[PDB]
Amino acid sequence: HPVTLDDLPLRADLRGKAPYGAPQLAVPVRLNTNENPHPPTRALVDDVVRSVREAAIDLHRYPDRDAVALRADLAGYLTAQTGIQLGVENIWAANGSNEILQQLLQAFGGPGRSAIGFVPSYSMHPIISDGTHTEWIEASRANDFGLDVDVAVAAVVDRKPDVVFIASPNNPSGQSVSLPDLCKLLDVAPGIAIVDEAYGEFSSQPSAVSLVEEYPSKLVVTRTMSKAFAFAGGRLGYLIATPAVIDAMLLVRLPYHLSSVTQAAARAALRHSDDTLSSVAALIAERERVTTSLNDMGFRVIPSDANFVLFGEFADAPAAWRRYLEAGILIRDVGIPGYLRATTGLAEENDAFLRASARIATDLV
Amino acid sequence: HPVTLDDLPLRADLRGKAPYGAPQLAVPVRLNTNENPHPPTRALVDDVVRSVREAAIDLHRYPDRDAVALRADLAGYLTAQTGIQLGVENIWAANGSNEILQQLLQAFGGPGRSAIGFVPSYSMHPIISDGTHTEWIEASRANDFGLDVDVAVAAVVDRKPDVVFIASPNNPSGQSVSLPDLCKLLDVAPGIAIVDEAYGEFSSQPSAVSLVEEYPSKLVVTRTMSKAFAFAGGRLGYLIATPAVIDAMLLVRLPYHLSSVTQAAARAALRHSDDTLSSVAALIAERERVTTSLNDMGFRVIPSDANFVLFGEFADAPAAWRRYLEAGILIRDVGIPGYLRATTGLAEENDAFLRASARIATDLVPV
């Protein structure tokens, strides 16, 4: 009596689904991922293998427990990428985005404290299990899956919370939240407000760090290397804020810190940020291309500020997904009636995606 | 900068008695955090560098979809480790411990479902992006800070949760859950039990993967390379269950999630398992020495199964933590009233901890 899916307490949502198991995807094109195609320069790779090679043995027991150089390096890069003059005393680093979110919640959240988060429809919000009372309002516009800034503010003045969560740009549509609008919230926020600029590097739009100096006792901006720095970024997490906040972090320092090698890898990655910015510049342009291109083909495309685009108005989206698959393109069914999510990629890939889009569009009534 | 800590709405809770500038924790011996202190090998390093170098430039194209290479290796590594026969069809890997816990939750939890976990669990209440409502419960024997199985089964029947997390070896104490005890719990699970054996490579008590093929529709156990592998393992998590659940993972996974670079790096480190195992053996060796040595000095030590020892019993834990630091020894106050967690380190570091223990000993609760 060997055991199968029917015996497992699966989520109902997933019953009857044939698992597309085996490596059943010769698919030249994968645009369902969440990071970055652009391969790494032989130059950047040599830096990594040098750097890592050097630290691995000798500095194994001697990591910079305070991630100073890395933090300065990040600060460096940020000041370039955003234009806001940043320094080591504004940056704080951790293993992942979850860790830095964890640290913040120990400084400003926890038992007795309360937070509220805003999520457009179909988003996936973090689950916070330390004593902090969190509530998640879904407040999108029945329109574009963007954040209904109006209810958001009203929700803040009413719930008067210790911490506020926003994503910008956010899932699922890749909408940014306009600076004016941030301010509107920051104005009514009584405590901390954390803005997740996970995708910030792809946004054609002033970064939220530009408002730090204006709201330094309130705003903290999260961010991550996982998106822009495929190679060597170690899926790292950092924050930008007033030097004082950084200080707050140092006093709730986690039971783990950043590997000596881990740190070096990340630094090497930053050392070649010129490319992994000019190639991000490459992406945005392409993303915009796919965008206009798709509309011209008759698709409804949700105008995005991320490494991806939400599109369609397909009657049977999951079938469309199968169709893309059967045509060599791997995009993402993200469980939204009528829409699929296609990551932006290399021009040669995007073209293929667009082509497949036409085949498919044509083959429908 | 006109703005300082008094302006920020910190929780009053920690407002005072802080900070603790890291220059004050600049101490020569730091048995404070939970990673392997044994550096990697050049043999290992040069090989992982090469594996990576190669996978980075050309092979960036076609990363193994189902990481079948990697899963094969992992299973090979684990059967050998545990004696229970294991194949690629029982294994599923992913970028970290969050990602496995995430997929597991996408499959068996999510919106509308519940999960319940335990204290003692980790020092950290994990944050994950699932939509699966989790609740943690007091279930530690005051006896020795392990897990109060009877409190736990009592909760798992009352709360009837979809998923049950179980740390084993669990944290503060570092003690595993007796295979019989897991059973008592698995009998009472409605849905799934995940058993987290991150620290398992250090446990003398046998692995829970013994119960998979005897509780196939209930049990999933997870591990990691982050504790045992000095290096290339870094963050990377796998799990072990009846093939049926691996099939389920295939269903919920973001198709090409495990890069050929991260895959190549891990595969290498698995090729040097003998190196890293011999050094895990060293750690256990050392942990035992410390443990007996502490007992001899009259410390109550909680018999550990991980890579640290929780030990007491001080008249005042934070006060003695401070004593240790003064002697140049940094260990962790896990917040327990009489005890302290001291990570097991290199021999020299361990000696220094003991020498310090010797003086500070004049400091435990009498009789």
XYZ file of C-alpha atoms in Angstrom:
732
model
C 0.000 0.000 0.000
C 2.594 2.653 -1.092
C 1.643 6.260 -0.176
C 0.619 8.990 -2.681
C -0.636 12.563 -2.786
C -4.142 11.485 -1.893
C -2.980 10.351 1.552
C -1.146 13.644 2.340
C -3.023 16.523 3.973
C -2.373 18.729 0.936
C -4.085 22.057 0.584
C -7.325 21.513 -1.307
C -6.137 24.160 -3.804
C -3.571 21.678 -5.092
C -5.490 18.392 -5.330
C -5.718 16.702 -8.743
C -2.759 18.715 -10.077
C -0.353 16.523 -12.021
C 3.056 17.511 -10.623
C 5.125 18.693 -13.599
C 7.916 16.510 -12.145
C 11.065 15.176 -13.839
C 13.260 17.756 -15.603
C 10.380 18.169 -18.130
C 11.687 21.619 -19.178
C 14.247 21.799 -22.014
C 12.645 25.283 -22.075
C 15.240 27.593 -23.526
C 13.514 30.448 -21.712
C 12.894 30.925 -18.010
C 11.275 34.238 -17.083
C 9.504 32.921 -13.993
C 12.468 33.413 -11.653
C 12.747 36.387 -9.418
C 16.247 37.744 -9.739
C 18.511 38.462 -12.629
C 19.763 36.841 -15.825
C 22.828 38.880 -16.826
C 25.733 36.554 -16.169
C 28.642 37.764 -14.162
C 31.744 39.323 -15.720
C 34.812 37.072 -15.758
C 36.099 40.149 -13.934
C 33.585 40.031 -11.119
C 33.957 36.240 -10.832
C 37.704 36.527 -10.444
C 37.210 39.137 -7.739
C 34.857 36.772 -5.884
C 37.094 33.733 -6.148
C 40.062 35.835 -5.106
C 38.262 37.489 -2.251
C 36.583 34.382 -0.947
C 39.687 32.295 -1.409
C 41.632 34.712 0.759
C 39.153 35.025 3.651
C 37.916 31.429 3.836
C 40.817 29.953 5.758
C 42.685 32.789 7.403
C 39.754 34.909 8.504
C 37.463 32.020 9.287
C 37.391 32.871 12.983
C 37.697 36.639 12.397
C 34.595 38.034 10.657
C 33.860 41.722 11.078
C 31.097 41.174 13.589
C 29.872 44.683 12.843
C 29.961 44.390 9.078
C 31.653 47.748 8.871
C 33.452 47.603 5.526
C 30.452 45.914 3.856
C 28.146 48.551 5.284
C 30.398 51.315 4.017
C 30.592 49.607 0.628
C 26.831 49.359 0.482
C 26.532 52.973 1.632
C 28.919 53.872 -1.151
C 26.878 52.122 -3.818
C 23.607 53.537 -2.514
C 24.803 57.105 -2.621
C 25.597 56.519 -6.303
C 22.483 54.497 -7.218
C 20.022 56.842 -5.450
C 21.896 60.095 -5.392
C 21.210 60.603 -1.707
C 24.471 61.123 0.174
C 24.775 58.038 2.407
C 27.396 56.699 4.770
C 28.300 53.640 6.805
C 26.401 55.043 9.785
C 23.065 54.800 7.903
C 23.396 51.197 6.766
C 22.824 47.966 8.674
C 23.356 44.477 7.291
C 22.095 40.945 7.978
C 21.830 37.389 6.580
C 18.561 37.939 4.799
C 15.576 40.230 4.627
C 13.836 38.222 7.273
C 16.684 38.806 9.712
C 16.751 42.594 9.304
C 12.949 42.590 9.628
C 13.426 40.551 12.773
C 15.930 42.946 14.295
C 13.673 45.901 13.676
C 10.813 44.164 15.378
C 12.916 43.610 18.487
C 13.846 47.249 18.701
C 10.456 48.745 17.823
C 7.909 45.950 18.069
C 7.360 42.894 20.238
C 4.854 42.253 23.061
C 2.477 45.120 23.911
C 3.534 46.866 20.688
C 1.451 46.627 17.522
C 2.018 46.896 13.803
C -0.169 47.116 10.734
C 0.724 46.163 7.189
C -0.746 47.051 3.850
C -1.019 44.517 1.080
C -2.589 44.908 -2.364
C -4.656 41.914 -3.436
C -2.821 38.570 -3.884
C 0.357 39.733 -2.120
C 2.297 37.569 0.291
C 2.939 39.314 3.596
C 5.434 38.089 6.281
C 4.017 36.348 9.377
C 5.219 37.918 12.606
C 5.133 35.660 15.610
C 6.948 37.609 18.312
C 4.665 39.323 20.853
C 3.855 42.189 18.423
C 0.206 42.472 17.457
C 0.020 42.671 13.700
C -2.908 43.156 11.392
C -2.811 43.236 7.644
C -5.206 45.409 5.757
C -5.671 44.470 2.119
C -6.357 47.842 0.544
C -5.800 47.779 -3.195
C -7.669 49.570 -5.967
C -10.076 47.273 -7.820
C -8.123 48.451 -10.810
C -4.377 47.869 -10.866
C -3.505 45.919 -7.686
C -1.817 49.056 -6.336
C -2.120 50.391 -2.805
C -5.202 52.496 -2.011
C -3.187 55.193 -0.263
C -6.441 56.780 1.013
C -7.593 53.943 3.228
C -3.992 53.318 4.168
C -3.639 56.723 5.805
C -7.072 56.560 7.375
C -6.061 53.149 8.734
C -2.941 54.644 10.211
C -4.586 57.590 11.953
C -7.099 55.130 13.350
C -5.011 52.198 14.389
C -2.240 54.499 15.585
C 0.398 51.702 15.321
C 3.958 51.387 16.620
C 5.111 49.990 13.238
C 3.818 50.332 9.671
C 4.693 47.980 6.765
C 4.696 48.968 3.115
C 6.085 47.423 -0.055
C 7.349 49.750 -2.784
C 7.452 48.627 -5.414
C 5.009 45.910 -4.381
C 3.702 42.548 -5.436
C 1.786 41.475 -7.357
C 1.704 44.207 -9.997
C 5.006 45.935 -9.313
C 3.419 49.294 -8.324
C 5.514 51.954 -6.616
C 4.025 54.209 -3.974
C 4.547 57.862 -4.922
C 6.825 59.904 -2.683
C 4.071 62.412 -1.976
C 2.013 59.416 -0.833
C 4.724 58.015 1.420
C 4.908 61.370 3.123
C 1.157 61.384 3.613
C 1.566 58.157 5.579
C 4.737 59.125 7.314
C 2.847 62.227 8.400
C 0.249 60.242 10.270
C 2.548 57.449 11.424
C 3.180 57.688 15.199
C 6.134 55.320 15.348
C 8.163 53.489 12.739
C 7.298 52.964 9.115
C 9.239 50.342 7.186
C 9.359 50.590 3.411
C 10.469 47.491 1.572
C 12.484 48.520 -1.432
C 13.217 44.923 -2.340
C 12.742 45.831 -6.012
C 13.824 49.452 -5.553
C 16.662 49.135 -7.997
C 14.365 48.556 -10.934
C 12.023 51.360 -10.138
C 12.191 54.381 -12.418
C 11.331 56.558 -9.538
C 12.891 58.373 -6.585
C 13.904 55.926 -3.827
C 12.357 56.103 -0.417
C 15.717 56.827 1.212
C 15.314 60.325 -0.166
C 12.759 60.932 2.635
C 14.847 59.521 5.429
C 16.499 62.847 6.048
C 13.062 64.476 6.155
C 11.479 61.878 8.474
C 14.453 60.480 10.333
C 12.635 59.510 13.531
C 10.092 57.403 11.570
C 11.192 56.024 8.201
C 13.336 52.942 7.762
C 13.995 51.535 4.286
C 14.576 47.808 3.773
C 16.472 46.484 0.806
C 18.210 43.447 -0.599
C 21.039 42.261 -2.781
C 19.261 39.084 -3.971
C 17.476 40.904 -6.871
C 20.210 43.014 -8.499
C 23.222 40.907 -7.479
C 22.528 37.409 -8.742
C 26.092 36.301 -8.219
C 27.807 36.834 -4.847
C 25.080 38.994 -3.312
C 24.483 36.125 -0.876
C 20.764 37.044 -0.804
C 21.764 39.671 1.809
C 19.489 42.166 3.541
C 20.198 45.751 4.620
C 18.469 48.819 5.895
C 18.914 52.537 5.393
C 17.984 54.976 8.215
C 19.151 57.693 10.617
C 22.445 56.886 12.278
C 20.449 56.483 15.524
C 18.387 53.587 14.150
C 21.554 51.798 13.087
C 22.580 52.255 16.720
C 19.345 50.699 17.902
C 20.260 47.660 15.793
C 23.686 47.245 17.345
C 22.023 46.782 20.692
C 19.630 44.027 19.581
C 22.311 42.141 17.685
C 21.221 38.626 16.705
C 22.801 35.313 17.846
C 24.366 35.042 14.386
C 26.269 37.506 12.228
C 27.721 37.426 8.702
C 30.197 34.797 7.603
C 33.697 36.068 6.994
C 33.583 34.615 3.490
C 29.960 35.679 3.087
C 30.987 39.300 3.687
C 33.875 39.206 1.232
C 31.731 37.729 -1.517
C 29.197 40.501 -1.087
C 31.894 43.202 -1.097
C 33.387 41.882 -4.324
C 29.946 41.992 -5.794
C 29.539 45.651 -4.891
C 32.987 46.400 -6.242
C 31.579 45.770 -9.728
C 28.274 47.524 -9.236
C 28.919 49.653 -12.312
C 27.898 46.762 -14.524
C 25.163 45.432 -12.324
C 23.582 48.877 -12.625
C 24.123 49.587 -16.272
C 22.692 46.102 -16.898
C 19.809 46.941 -14.603
C 19.449 50.024 -16.743
C 19.372 47.546 -19.599
C 16.522 45.646 -17.934
C 14.229 48.593 -17.189
C 14.405 49.664 -20.857
C 13.615 46.165 -21.979
C 10.849 45.891 -19.393
C 9.379 49.047 -20.875
C 9.814 47.565 -24.327
C 7.982 44.352 -23.505
C 5.397 46.614 -21.941
C 4.529 48.762 -24.937
C 5.111 45.833 -27.215
C 2.495 43.725 -25.394
C -0.144 46.445 -25.410
C 0.338 47.046 -29.079
C -0.425 43.349 -29.385
C -3.689 43.897 -27.513
C -2.674 42.707 -24.036
C -3.540 44.630 -20.896
C -0.269 45.236 -19.073
C 0.012 46.467 -15.491
C 2.738 49.121 -15.695
C 5.465 47.908 -13.395
C 8.499 49.264 -11.513
C 10.065 45.877 -10.896
C 12.110 43.070 -12.443
C 8.898 41.685 -13.927
C 5.541 42.515 -15.537
C 1.965 41.483 -14.743
C -0.097 41.054 -17.814
C -2.864 39.621 -19.784
C -6.609 39.598 -19.457
C -6.596 35.878 -20.342
C -9.929 34.139 -19.736
C -8.177 30.933 -18.690
C -4.806 32.100 -17.358
C -3.636 28.725 -16.217
C -4.212 27.458 -19.765
C -2.318 30.412 -21.147
C 0.434 29.374 -18.830
C 0.425 25.886 -20.283
C 0.470 27.483 -23.710
C 3.576 29.570 -22.945
C 5.158 26.477 -21.551
C 4.313 24.438 -24.628
C 5.926 27.143 -26.693
C 9.263 27.164 -24.797
C 8.570 30.060 -22.473
C 8.458 29.621 -18.715
C 6.573 32.358 -16.999
C 4.682 32.380 -13.733
C 1.045 31.616 -12.937
C 0.647 33.604 -9.797
C -2.920 32.498 -9.083
C -4.668 35.634 -10.269
C -7.695 35.204 -12.521
C -6.722 36.479 -15.958
C -3.111 37.401 -15.391
C 0.296 35.937 -15.648
C 3.640 37.283 -14.405
C 6.585 37.412 -16.770
C 10.051 38.318 -15.452
C 12.050 40.678 -17.636
C 15.194 39.083 -19.118
C 17.806 39.208 -21.892
C 16.647 40.833 -25.092
C 16.986 37.558 -26.989
C 14.711 36.034 -24.316
C 12.203 38.803 -24.155
C 11.846 38.675 -27.899
C 11.046 34.988 -27.675
C 8.539 35.725 -24.935
C 6.858 38.397 -27.079
C 6.777 36.038 -30.060
C 5.123 33.350 -28.066
C 2.722 35.975 -26.796
C 1.590 36.601 -30.380
C 1.265 32.988 -31.394
C -0.941 32.582 -28.344
C -2.990 35.722 -28.660
C -3.722 34.746 -32.296
C -4.846 31.262 -31.379
C -7.707 32.575 -29.218
C -11.139 33.885 -30.233
C 22.004 63.374 13.760
C 20.148 66.004 15.792
C 17.984 62.886 16.337
C 19.161 60.179 18.732
C 17.934 57.073 20.521
C 15.666 59.066 22.838
C 13.596 60.198 19.854
C 13.077 56.710 18.436
C 10.138 54.778 19.876
C 12.195 51.843 21.222
C 10.308 49.558 23.553
C 10.837 50.859 27.091
C 11.644 47.210 27.774
C 15.175 47.587 26.407
C 15.470 51.361 26.503
C 17.810 50.988 29.561
C 20.942 48.924 30.443
C 22.129 49.310 26.838
C 23.940 49.578 24.460
C 26.870 47.131 24.484
C 29.387 48.607 21.998
C 31.128 45.783 20.124
C 34.502 47.206 21.182
C 33.418 45.991 24.689
C 32.726 42.575 23.192
C 36.181 42.632 21.424
C 37.038 39.651 23.566
C 39.658 37.066 22.517
C 37.325 34.111 23.078
C 33.845 34.161 21.677
C 31.812 31.003 22.241
C 28.796 32.961 21.587
C 27.221 32.052 18.259
C 26.348 28.737 16.730
C 28.709 28.015 13.834
C 31.468 25.528 13.173
C 34.827 27.081 14.262
C 36.869 24.705 12.125
C 38.100 26.425 9.008
C 37.581 24.632 5.672
C 40.363 22.763 3.812
C 42.335 24.106 0.862
C 41.410 20.816 -0.731
C 37.769 21.781 -0.094
C 38.199 25.471 -0.882
C 40.113 25.054 -4.150
C 37.516 22.560 -5.266
C 34.516 24.745 -4.369
C 36.179 27.761 -5.973
C 36.693 25.706 -9.157
C 33.176 24.210 -9.084
C 31.873 27.755 -8.744
C 34.200 29.416 -11.226
C 33.013 26.905 -13.828
C 29.301 27.084 -12.976
C 29.397 30.872 -13.023
C 30.503 31.655 -16.532
C 29.369 29.005 -19.059
C 27.005 26.759 -17.021
C 24.871 29.740 -15.843
C 22.528 28.590 -18.626
C 21.148 25.174 -17.681
C 20.896 24.720 -13.886
C 19.577 21.271 -12.835
C 15.816 21.740 -12.606
C 15.262 19.178 -9.893
C 18.775 19.429 -8.499
C 19.033 15.686 -9.053
C 22.788 15.622 -8.855
C 22.616 17.463 -5.567
C 19.730 15.391 -4.190
C 21.578 12.181 -5.152
C 24.649 13.352 -3.272
C 22.682 14.517 -0.257
C 20.972 11.132 -0.022
C 24.293 9.320 -0.407
C 25.640 11.545 2.355
C 22.669 10.884 4.567
C 22.179 7.154 4.215
C 25.825 6.819 5.181
C 25.301 9.233 8.044
C 22.083 7.636 9.402
C 22.076 4.009 8.236
C 18.442 4.370 7.039
C 18.389 3.662 3.300
C 17.791 6.888 1.367
C 17.393 7.802 -2.285
C 16.932 10.916 -4.420
C 13.185 10.275 -4.294
C 13.117 11.006 -0.514
C 15.102 14.246 -0.745
C 14.229 17.810 -1.697
C 16.632 20.781 -1.582
C 16.265 24.561 -1.671
C 18.212 27.778 -1.020
C 17.821 27.871 2.730
C 15.970 26.659 5.781
C 13.385 29.407 5.202
C 12.723 28.268 1.683
C 12.091 24.604 2.650
C 9.903 25.705 5.551
C 8.256 27.980 3.026
C 7.518 25.378 0.357
C 6.346 22.930 3.014
C 3.884 25.604 4.084
C 2.779 26.389 0.561
C 1.894 22.702 0.267
C 0.320 21.973 3.658
C -0.435 25.295 5.333
C -1.186 28.719 3.824
C -4.234 30.946 4.201
C -7.061 29.391 6.213
C -4.686 26.899 7.902
C -2.897 26.833 11.278
C 0.573 25.860 12.476
C 1.821 25.437 16.031
C 5.429 25.460 17.227
C 7.222 25.228 20.545
C 9.220 27.013 23.213
C 11.896 25.871 23.569
C 12.454 26.190 19.802
C 15.137 28.620 18.641
C 16.409 31.845 20.168
C 14.681 33.464 17.168
C 10.950 33.489 16.356
C 11.269 32.939 12.600
C 9.499 35.229 10.154
C 8.330 33.585 6.952
C 6.195 34.745 3.960
C 3.419 32.137 3.913
C 0.097 33.408 5.161
C 0.128 30.411 7.483
C -0.866 31.537 11.004
C 1.616 30.171 13.526
C 1.352 29.965 17.301
C 4.114 29.002 19.734
C 3.512 27.307 23.040
C 5.213 26.803 26.413
C 6.257 23.203 26.633
C 9.633 22.913 28.336
C 10.277 20.565 31.253
C 11.348 22.852 34.108
C 13.362 19.776 35.036
C 16.002 20.261 32.339
C 14.601 22.613 29.670
C 13.945 19.916 27.060
C 10.476 19.438 25.582
C 7.540 18.502 27.826
C 6.090 15.908 25.483
C 2.909 15.576 27.509
C 2.234 19.279 27.407
C 2.946 19.093 23.683
C 0.590 16.206 22.761
C -1.925 17.963 25.018
C -1.622 21.060 22.888
C -1.530 19.240 19.567
C -4.880 17.500 20.356
C -6.558 20.641 21.694
C -5.317 23.005 18.902
C -5.674 20.398 16.123
C -3.108 22.163 13.901
C -2.332 21.655 10.258
C 1.411 21.723 10.893
C 3.518 21.132 13.967
C 7.064 22.403 14.114
C 9.431 20.539 16.352
C 13.027 21.467 17.022
C 15.235 18.403 17.637
C 17.840 18.916 19.025
C 15.740 21.844 20.315
C 17.538 24.987 21.299
C 18.255 26.435 24.699
C 18.995 22.946 26.166
C 20.238 21.224 23.045
C 18.372 17.993 23.640
C 16.733 15.733 21.108
C 13.255 14.237 21.299
C 13.262 10.510 22.068
C 12.111 8.544 19.068
C 9.300 7.145 21.206
C 8.285 10.702 22.090
C 8.072 11.864 18.483
C 5.752 8.947 17.985
C 3.477 10.045 20.803
C 3.234 13.377 18.950
C 2.878 12.073 15.423
C -0.055 9.949 16.617
C -1.720 13.164 17.677
C -0.981 15.333 14.613
C -3.903 15.967 12.307
C -1.762 17.131 9.422
C 2.018 17.364 9.324
C 4.921 17.355 11.695
C 8.129 18.980 10.594
C 11.125 17.950 12.627
C 14.033 20.313 12.372
C 17.347 18.518 12.696
C 19.618 21.401 11.778
C 21.794 20.486 14.740
C 21.343 16.781 14.061
C 24.829 16.168 12.718
C 25.930 16.649 16.351
C 23.389 14.347 17.965
C 24.353 10.982 19.379
C 20.717 9.969 19.672
C 19.639 8.516 16.258
C 17.910 10.548 13.499
C 14.152 10.860 13.179
C 14.323 9.924 9.520
C 13.858 6.495 11.080
C 10.187 7.271 11.407
C 9.457 8.543 7.871
C 8.720 5.187 6.333
C 6.693 4.393 9.446
C 4.634 7.629 9.436
C 4.823 8.505 5.748
C 1.762 10.749 5.476
C 2.577 12.761 8.608
C 6.287 13.229 8.959
C 8.713 15.539 7.240
C 12.162 16.145 8.678
C 14.422 19.029 7.598
C 18.142 19.741 7.758
C 20.769 22.177 6.658
C 24.396 22.480 5.747
C 24.823 25.734 7.657
C 25.809 24.149 10.948
C 27.886 21.198 9.799
C 29.578 22.632 6.712
C 32.397 24.993 7.471
C 31.923 26.776 4.170
C 30.323 26.014 0.834
C 27.258 24.549 2.512
C 26.566 28.061 3.787
C 22.853 28.649 3.579
C 21.205 25.656 1.922
C 18.414 23.459 3.232
C 17.094 20.054 2.357
C 14.343 17.835 3.656
C 13.579 14.154 3.883
C 10.238 12.363 3.492
C 8.242 9.710 1.696
C 8.522 10.233 -2.068
C 4.883 11.366 -2.071
C 5.844 14.639 -0.372
C 8.768 15.184 -2.704
C 6.269 14.938 -5.543
C 4.201 17.561 -3.665
C 7.214 19.867 -3.471
C 7.658 19.524 -7.235
C 4.140 20.860 -7.437
C 4.638 24.007 -5.301
C 8.155 24.979 -6.132
C 9.179 27.969 -8.188
C 10.459 25.808 -11.002
C 14.139 26.844 -11.462
C 14.921 28.076 -7.923
C 18.295 26.501 -7.192
C 21.044 28.205 -9.254
C 23.775 26.123 -10.854
C 26.257 28.189 -8.843
C 24.665 27.465 -5.482
C 24.131 23.848 -6.641
C 27.777 23.431 -7.700
C 29.023 24.919 -4.459
C 27.036 22.491 -2.302
C 27.896 19.420 -4.346
C 31.545 20.237 -3.809
C 31.197 20.524 -0.077
C 29.462 17.122 -0.033
C 32.502 15.781 -1.844
C 34.503 16.729 1.240
C 32.147 15.366 3.803
C 34.905 13.225 5.387
C 36.886 16.327 6.257
C 33.891 18.078 7.825
C 32.623 14.999 9.615
C 36.021 14.397 11.250
C 35.786 17.959 12.519
C 32.211 17.488 13.725
C 33.555 14.491 15.634
C 36.132 16.840 17.122
C 33.397 19.153 18.286
C 31.406 16.444 19.920
C 34.638 15.222 21.504
C 35.258 18.719 22.787
C 31.685 19.219 23.926
C 31.922 16.070 25.988
C 35.195 17.160 27.586
C 33.689 20.506 28.485
C 30.562 18.896 29.819
C 32.377 16.442 32.084
C 34.892 19.053 33.066
C 32.103 21.444 34.049
C 30.262 18.780 36.046
C 33.433 17.953 37.872
C 33.647 21.575 38.865
C 30.118 21.114 40.154
C 28.186 22.856 37.413
C 24.860 21.441 36.442
C 25.207 20.889 32.712
C 22.209 19.939 30.585
C 23.227 16.871 28.599
C 23.491 18.371 25.136
C 23.096 16.921 21.654
C 24.015 20.008 19.667
C 27.149 22.164 19.479
C 26.760 24.179 22.667
C 25.959 23.417 26.314
C 23.434 25.110 28.518
C 24.854 25.028 32.027
C 24.373 26.499 35.491
C 23.342 27.011 38.049
C 24.257 30.597 38.910
C 22.908 32.640 41.760
C 22.497 35.270 39.043
C 22.906 34.374 35.370
C 23.437 37.861 33.874
C 25.854 38.645 36.688
C 28.002 35.642 35.901
C 27.746 36.220 32.172
C 29.354 39.528 33.006
C 32.027 37.793 35.079
C 32.914 35.613 32.093
C 33.178 38.579 29.795
C 35.489 40.227 32.307
C 37.720 37.196 31.966
C 37.680 37.741 28.200
C 35.082 35.074 27.486
C 31.936 35.831 25.557
C 29.126 33.334 25.844
C 25.364 33.889 25.483
C 22.675 34.610 28.111
C 19.828 32.746 26.519
C 17.575 34.412 29.044
C 17.206 31.529 31.380
C 17.352 32.509 35.001
C 20.119 30.286 36.246
C 21.911 29.063 33.182
C 24.031 30.235 30.245
C 24.670 28.866 26.790
C 28.268 28.329 25.885
C 29.015 27.299 22.356
C 31.611 24.603 22.006
C 34.717 25.868 20.210
C 38.295 24.981 19.428
C 40.343 23.189 22.047
C 42.245 26.341 23.119
C 39.055 28.382 23.349
C 37.404 25.560 25.301
C 40.283 25.483 27.779
C 40.007 29.205 28.315
C 36.289 28.807 28.993
C 37.013 26.169 31.588
C 39.825 28.004 33.291
C 37.394 30.915 33.607
C 34.615 28.568 34.756
C 36.966 27.414 37.501
C 37.293 30.924 39.019
C 33.740 32.058 38.400
C 32.542 28.786 39.918
C 32.774 30.458 43.353
C 29.383 31.837 42.379
C 26.742 29.138 41.998
C 23.702 28.523 44.284
C 24.958 26.658 47.465
C 24.233 23.123 49.009
